[PDB]
Amino acid sequence: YKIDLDKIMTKMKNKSVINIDDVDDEELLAILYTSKQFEKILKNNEDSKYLENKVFCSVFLEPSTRTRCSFDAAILKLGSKVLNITDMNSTSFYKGETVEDAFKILSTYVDGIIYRDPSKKNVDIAVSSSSKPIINAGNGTGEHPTQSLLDFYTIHNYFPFILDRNINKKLNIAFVGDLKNGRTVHSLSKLLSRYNVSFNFVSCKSLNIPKDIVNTITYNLKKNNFYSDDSIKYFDNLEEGLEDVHIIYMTRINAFILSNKTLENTRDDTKILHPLPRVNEIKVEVDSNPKSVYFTQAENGLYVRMALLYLIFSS
Amino acid sequence: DLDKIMTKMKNKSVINIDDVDDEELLAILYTSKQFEKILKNNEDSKYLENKVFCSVFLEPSTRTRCSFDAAILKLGSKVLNITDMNSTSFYKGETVEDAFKILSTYVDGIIYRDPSKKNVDIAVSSSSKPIINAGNGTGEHPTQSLLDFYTIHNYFPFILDRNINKKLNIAFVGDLKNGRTVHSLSKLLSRYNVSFNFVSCKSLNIPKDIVNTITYNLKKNNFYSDDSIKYFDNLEEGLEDVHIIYMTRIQNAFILSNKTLENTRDDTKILHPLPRVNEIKVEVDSNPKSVYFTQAENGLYVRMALLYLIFSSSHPQ
Amino acid sequence: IDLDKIMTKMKNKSVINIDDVDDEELLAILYTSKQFEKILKNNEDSKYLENKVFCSVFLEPSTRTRCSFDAAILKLGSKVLNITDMNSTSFYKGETVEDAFKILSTYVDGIIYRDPSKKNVDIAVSSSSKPIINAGNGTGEHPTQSLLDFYTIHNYFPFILDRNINKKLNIAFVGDLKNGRTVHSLSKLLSRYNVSFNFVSCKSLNIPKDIVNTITYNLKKNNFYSDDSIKYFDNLEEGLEDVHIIYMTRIQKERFTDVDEYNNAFILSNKTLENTRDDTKILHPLPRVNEIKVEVDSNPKSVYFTQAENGLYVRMALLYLIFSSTSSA
Ligand SMILES: COCCNC(=O)c1cc(-c2ccccc2)sc1N
Ligand code: NA
C-alpha cells in the first residue's frame, strides 16, 4: 500500500508504548492501516480473533472506566483474555511493596500489561522492572499515547492528505478550552507537527498553551520545512478561533461553549472532536450537526487499541 | 417455532416482564430446558461464542451478576465487568445518554443493574445495542420472573395450557408491599389460569395497582372470579389449597416450618427468590416440597436461554 | 510414577490444608508443575483445561495470590467470574455462607476462596457441591504457598523426596516465626522428609511450641529425628551456618499491637551470606520490606523471584489435576 509491514511487525514485536514519541513514521502507518482493517472486520461482523492464547493484566490505579473498558473490549475481541486490577490507587495496590518488585513478579504471570497510574514515575519504573511489554493507558506527564493514535486516526479518515506530507497538503486545526492541562492537546500537537499542519490555540489567559509544546511543534514543523510565522495563531474568542480550521478539537473543563450558532461561520468540511467526557463545552444540539464526530472518535479507540495489541503481541 | 421466534427476539431489549409476550415465554422456557439437560449431561454448552458483553452493576447484587456472567461464559462468550460503583462514581459527571452511546460501540450487549428506574430507560434510548435489565428501582427484574415461572412450569406444566379446568393456586407470603418480585411474577401468572392467596401483615398488604393488573389479566382470559384473589393474616388459612408457596424477603410473623407445611397439598412446592433469613427454617431444606435452591440454579439456564435467543447470529439438543 | 491413578484420586478433591495432600499427590503436583514450567518456557499451547468456568472469591485484598490464580485459570484456557475488594460482610450481606456456597456452586465448576475467617472456608467446603481451593485463611492454611515453596526447594535439592537417612536437607526460617504462618504450613510439609530446622528469631517471635511438636512428631514417624533436628538462634551468624535453604519470613506492621513493636532485626545482605554453603538458596514468600537488600537480588543464591513465578506453574498443575474431566493429555 505505502510501506513494507511484516518487518514493521518485527520492529514492533515486544515494544512498550509509553509516549507517542516511541512511535515512528512506519509504526504509525502500520497502526493506522491495521486499525482500518479491524474497523471493516467489525463493521462486517466478521471474525476478529487474530490474537488468541494471550493473557494480559490491566492495572487501573485511578478511576478511568472508559479507557479500561476500551482496552478490555480490544483484548476480548482479538480473542485473548485479561485479569483486571481496579478501583484501587497507587497506595492500596503497592501497600509496602516497591513498584520494581510488583512489576518484576506480575510480568512472570502475563504476556503484557496495560497500566494507568497518575504517577509519571511509576510507569517508567514499571518499564524498568517488567520482563513484558507495557502499554501506558494514561499517566501524570499527560502521556496517553493510544488517545493520540485514535485522535490522529479520526482526523486521517476525514483528511488523509495529513499523511501525504507536501506544502500543498496543509491541515489547520483549532484546540479550544483548557490548553494548560489538556494533556490530550499536547500529545496530539506533538504527533500533528510531524506533518503539514497549522494550529489555532483558543484559550482564556490562565489556560494558554505551554511554551514547551509550542517549541516541539516549531522544532518538528521546521524538520519537514512546513513552519512559518502563520503556522501558530492564538485567539481569545471562538468567533475568529473556529475559522479556516478543518478540525475543531474541544478540551475537557467555561468561556467557549460550542453551539449550532457558533458553528455557522466554519468551513463546510470542518469536523468536531472531543476526547470526552464533555460537561457543558458542546451543547446537545451539536450532536445532530453532521460536522460532529466525537462519538465515532471514541468508537475508533477500539479499532486502534486492537491494532496496537495485534502489532506488538502477535508471534 | 424457534427460527421464527428467535428472529423476532434478535437484538430485543428486555427491561420489563411485559416486554415478553406468550410466544417469547415459550421459546425462553423451551431453550432454558435445553440448556438444563446439556449442562446436567456435561455436554458442550458453547452455543454463543465470539460475543463480548459489558455487565454494569451500579448496586451490590452479587448473585444476579455472578449468574449472568456464568451464563455468558458457559455459552462460550466473554464479558467486561463494571462493578463496586454507584450511579455517581460511574457517570462521574457524564450524561447517561453519552455513557451508553459510547459504551455500546465497544460491545454486543449490556447487562445493566441500577437502582434508578430512569437510568435504565435512558440507557435503552441511547444504546446502539440490546440491554437486559438485571434489576432497577421500578422493581422491574424480568429474569427473576422468568426463572420463577420456569421453576413453577417444571412442577405444573398446565399453567401454559390456559385450560378452564387446570387452574394453579399460589400463596405469596411476607412483605407484599415492597416485594417487587411478587409484583413482577403476579403480573406474569395472571396471564394464565391462576389464583392468588396474599398472606401479609396490614402495612405490608399487596398494593391496589397490582390487584388491578391481576384482575385485568385474569378477565382478559376469562379466568377471573371473586375467589381468584383471597387475603389472609395467617399461614394456616394462607397455605390452604396452593400448588406453590412463594415466600418473600424482608428489609418475624410468617416463618415456614415442617409444622406449617403439614396441611398443604402433597404436590405443593416452596419458592423463595433468596436470600432467606428466618422466613424458612433449615429443617424445610430436607422436605422434598422445598425447591428454592433449584429455583436459584434455574436462573443460569434461563439467563443462557435469554442471551442465546437475543444475541445468536444447531438449535440446542 | 502412576499419574492415571493419582489424577483419578484427585478429581474433584478440595484442597483446604497441606495435610489434604499426601505423598503421591505431592509427586503428581511437583511432576505436573514441572511440565507446565517447560510448556510456558517453550511458548507452547498450555490450554489443557478449557470449557471450565471458575469463581474466584477474594474477601480480603490479596492481589498477588488472586492475580496468580486468575493467570493460571486463563492460561489453562478456562474462564473465571471474580469477587474482589469485598470483605466477608459486604458479600454475604445477610446470607448464611452455607446458602451462598450451595447456590454459587450450581453455576461454576470450582471455586478459589480466600477469606480471613478459618470457619467460613470450612463451611464453604461442607455446603459446596463443587471443589474449593483455599487461597489463604485465618488458621494460616495457605496450601498453594506450601506447594510452590516446596516446589522451589525440590528444584535445587531433589533428595528431600528420596527420604534417605544420609541425604538430609537443613533449612533456616528467619524473622517473625510466631506470625509467619507460611513457616508453619511449610515446616509441616518439610518434617514429612529428612530435614533439619534452624529457627532464627527474636524472643517475642520464637516459633510456636505446637509447630515444634508436629515437626518432632513427623520426623520421629520416619526415623529422621535427633536432638540436632531443631536448633534455635538469635543471630544470622549461627543461624545461616550449614543450611541448604534460607527462608526469610515477612514482617507485617499488622500482628504488632503498635508501630513501636515492628522496629527489623534480621536483614539479609551480601555480608551475611559470606559464611553460607555455596549451594544455599534464599526464598521469601514476598512482598519484602527491608529484610532482603536489593544488592542480594544479583547474588545467584537468591531465587525468591523464581519462587513467586513457580506459583503460576503449581496453581496450573493443581487446577489441571483436580478439574480436568477424565483427561490424559
Ligand atoms: C503489594 O503486594 C501485595 C501483596 N502481595 C502478595 O504477595 C499477596 C497478597 C497477600 C497479602 C498481603 C498482605 C496482607 C494480606 C494478604 S498474600 C499474597 N500472595
Ligand atoms: Na473477566
The CA distance from C320 to A160, in Å, is 52
Contact C93 B293 (CB under 8 A): no
Element containing residue A29 per DSSP (H, E): helix A25-43
Cβ contact C171:C198 at 8 Å:
yes
The CA distance from C317 to B158, in Å, is 50
B52-57 vs B78-82, strand pairing mode: parallel
Note whether C156 and C128 are same-domain residues. Answer: no
Cβ-count burial B96-109 (b if 16+ within 10 Å, e if not): bebbbbbbbbbbbb
**CATH number, position B286:** 3.40.50.1370
Note whether A196 and A74 are same-domain residues. Answer: no
In a domain, C155, yes or no: yes
Three-state secondary structure readout of chain B: CHHHHHHHHCCCCECCHHHCCHHHHHHHHHHHHHHHHHHHCCCCCCCCCCCEEEEEECCCCHHHHHHHHHHHHHCCCEEEEECCCCCCCCCCCCCHHHHHHHHHHHCCEEEEECCCHHHHHHHHHHCCCCEEEEECCCCCCHHHHHHHHHHHHHHCHHHHHCCCCCCEEEEEECCCCCCHHHHHHHHHHCCCCEEEEEECCHHHCCCHHHHHHHHHHHHHCCCCCCCCEEEECCHHHHCCCCCEEEECCCCCCCCECCCCCCCCCCCCEEECCCCCCCCECHHHHCCCCECHHHHHHHHHHHHHHHHHHHHCCCCCC
The CA distance from B296 to B302, in Å, is 10
The CA distance from B56 to B79, in Å, is 10
**Starting at the edge strand that comes first in sequence, how are the strands of the sheet with B194-199 ordered?**
B229-232, B194-199, B168-173, B244-247, B269-271
Residue found under cell 488468541: A52
Plot region of A199 (φ>0 → left; ψ -120 to 50 → alpha; else → beta): beta
Note whether C285 and C313 are same-domain residues. Answer: no
Cβ contact C181:C214 at 8 Å:
no
A55-60 vs A112-116, strand pairing mode: parallel
Among residues C103, C15, C68, A232, the alpha carbon closest in space to that of B67 is found at C103
Note whether C31 and C75 are same-domain residues. Answer: yes
In a domain, B122, yes or no: yes
Note whether C106 and C31 are same-domain residues. Answer: yes
In a domain, C329, yes or no: no
Note whether B181 and B288 are same-domain residues. Answer: yes
Q: Quote the domain boundaries for residue A36.
A: 7-144+299-313
Note whether C107 and C157 are same-domain residues. Answer: no
Q: Which residues of C touch B73 (CB under 8 A)?
A: 53, 79, 81
The CA distance from C106 to C85, in Å, is 23
Facing C103 at nearest CB: one of B69, B81, B274: B274
Query: Which ligand has the nearest atom to the CA of C115?
Result: 1
Residue type, C147: L
Among residues A249, A242, A287, the alpha carbon closest in space to that of A268 is found at A242
In a domain, A212, yes or no: yes
Among residues B306, B274, B291, B249, the alpha carbon closest in space to that of B68 is found at B306
Counting every residue, how long is chain A? 315
- C-alpha of A227 from chain center: 24
Contacts of C181 (CB under 8 A, 6+ apart): C139, C140, C142
In a domain, B216, yes or no: yes
The pair phi, psi for residue B293, each rounded to 5°, is: -80, -40
Which DSSP string corresponds to A222-242?
Answer: HHTT---TTSEEEESSHHHHT
Looking at the complex, report in whole angstroms how far the Cα of residue A82 sits from the nearest Cα belonging to chain C. Answer: 8
In a domain, C76, yes or no: yes
Note whether B161 and B137 are same-domain residues. Answer: no
**Starting at the edge strand that comes first in sequence, how are the strands of the sheet with C53-58 ordered?**
C79-83, C53-58, C110-114, C132-136
Note whether C315 and C186 are same-domain residues. Answer: no
Assess whether B276 carries a catalytic annotation: no
The CA distance from C127 to A77, in Å, is 37
Report the atom number in ligand 1 closest to the C-alpha of A97. 1
Query: Which ligand has the nearest atom to the CA of C252?
Result: 1
Note whether B64 and B92 are same-domain residues. Answer: yes
CB atoms within 10 A of CB C137: 24
B237 touches chain C (CB under 8 A): no
**Starting at the edge strand that comes first in sequence, how are the strands of the sheet with A81-85 ordered?**
A81-85, A55-60, A112-116, A134-138
Q: At what angle do helices A294-313 and A65-77 cross, to 10 degrees?
A: 50
Query: Dihedral, CA atoms, A170, A171, A176, A182, nearest 10 degrees?
Result: -90
Query: What is the resolution in angstroms?
Result: 2.5
Contact B81 A84 (CB under 8 A): yes
Q: Return the residues preceding each gap in chain A, C–N over 2.5 A, or none.
A: 253
Number of domains in chain C: 2
Note whether A158 and A275 are same-domain residues. Answer: yes
B298 touches chain C (CB under 8 A): no
Note whether A288 and A156 are same-domain residues. Answer: yes
Residue C62 C-alpha to ligand 1 middle, in angstroms? 5
In a domain, C92, yes or no: yes
Q: Is the dihedral of CA B241, B247, B252, B256 positive or negative?
A: positive
CB atoms within 10 A of CB B258: 12
Element containing residue A167 per DSSP (H, E): none
Cβ contact A130:A105 at 8 Å:
no
Cell numbers found for residue A277: 467526557
Method: X-ray
In a domain, C328, yes or no: no
